[PDB]
Design a binder for this molecule. Structure first.
Ligand code: OGA
Ligand code: NI
Ligand code: ZN
Length: 331
């Protein structure tokens, strides 16, 4: 078996290898990349997402989210307080202000230490889930707005045609902005391109050990666990690497820099934080190997998770027994 220790693998495709997206995902998996839950892909030197990022300041962040923490430094939840709309230019200025800017630090490890020590004492503001793309339409390789759709994958594999669409989202972050422990909707893949700015540090649990993280989460957030059998779907819970280590949870970490892709694999729990002002673009996708994960994916039915239109068909076709209860949670 390839990659039995479930290490995060890093790939350097040639420009020739960068033509066929599906084929390269399949290649990465042939090398065991999926066992980690997360892989890094460094694009060939000849590739570019777009010409420049000089004209992005007028993009609107309609609902910036202030991420307010509760708990202890290594075990906390965050809720999102809606703030007034601001442009990306205004957001960048805010990110760079004395109140919100990245502190002096020696290296990534030093900054990681500062993050877990001090995160809960601040409430950074995040521009998340903004529908759109920064890929040039003429970028033909690994353009996250031009991927084959999950609906077409399901149709190709299972022969049923379904409604729904599948488009990318932009994320504008600043120092300490945080993504909570989660897997993707329907335990899909995700792919994330860091367009511009400061790094993003990722933590990931191997898919074969996902239930170990779930069990610890139930212990650490007992009220939440009683309220919902799949509360990590709420995407609000954080657990530090120190606490994971103390509890023997297998995981890995890696820092993504501008110009790099990350892929998360089905049922790979991940969490992380941004080092400073940046912009990422991400989208979910599927492969034939995903179908069995989609069939088995946990669902939140307590009403908190509240997801896209397009997830309806996924649950309806892949999980017909769960469909009634789940839909009650969406309505
Ligand atoms: O970048 C973020 O804030 C969160 N991204 C993801 O969880 C992802 O790409 O799957
Ligand atoms: Ni994700
Ligand atoms: Zn729930």
């Amino acid at each position: 078996a390839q990659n039995p220790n479930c290490n995060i693998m890093i790939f350097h495709p040639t420009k020739e290898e960068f033509n066929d997206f599906d084929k390269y995902i399949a290649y990465m998996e042939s090398q065991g990349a999926h066992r980690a839950g997360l892989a890094k892909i460094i694009p060939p030197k000849e590739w570019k997402a777009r010409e420049t990022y000089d004209n992005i300041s007028e993009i609107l962040i309609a609902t910036p989210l202030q991420q307010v923490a509760s708990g202890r430094a290594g075990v906390f939840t965050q809720y999102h307080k809606k703030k007034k709309a601001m442009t990306v230019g205004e957001y960048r200025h805010l990110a760079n202000s004395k109140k919100y800017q990245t502190p002096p630090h020696q290296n990534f490890e030093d900054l990681e230490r500062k993050y877990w020590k001090n995160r809960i004492y601040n409430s950074p503001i995040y521009g998340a889930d903004i529908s759109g793309s920064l890929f040039d339409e003429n970028t033909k390789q690994w353009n996250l707005g031009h991927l084959g759709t999950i609906q077409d994958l399901l149709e190709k594999e299972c022969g049923v045609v379904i409604e729904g669409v599948n488009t990318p989202y932009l994320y504008f972050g600043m120092w300490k902005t945080t993504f909570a422990w989660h897997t993707e909707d329907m335990d899909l893949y995700s792919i994330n391109y860091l367009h511009l700015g400061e790094p993003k540090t990722w933590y990931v649990v191997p898919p074969e050990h996902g239930q170990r993280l779930e069990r610890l989460a139930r212990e650490l957030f007992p009220g939440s666990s009683r309220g919902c059998g799949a509360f990590l779907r709420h995407k609000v819970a954080l657990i530090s690497p120190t606490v994971l280590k103390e509890n023997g949870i297998p995981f890995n970490r890696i820092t993504q820099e501008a110009g790099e892709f990350m892929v998360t694999f089905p049922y790979g729990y991940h969490a992380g934080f941004n080092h400073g002002f940046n912009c990422a673009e991400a989208i979910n996708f599927a492969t034939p190997r995903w179908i069995d994960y989609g069939k088995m994916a946990s669902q939140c039915s307590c009403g908190e998770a509240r997801v896209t239109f397009s997830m309806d068909a996924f649950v309806r076709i892949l999980q017909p027994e769960r469909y009634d209860l789940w839909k009650r949670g969406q309505d």
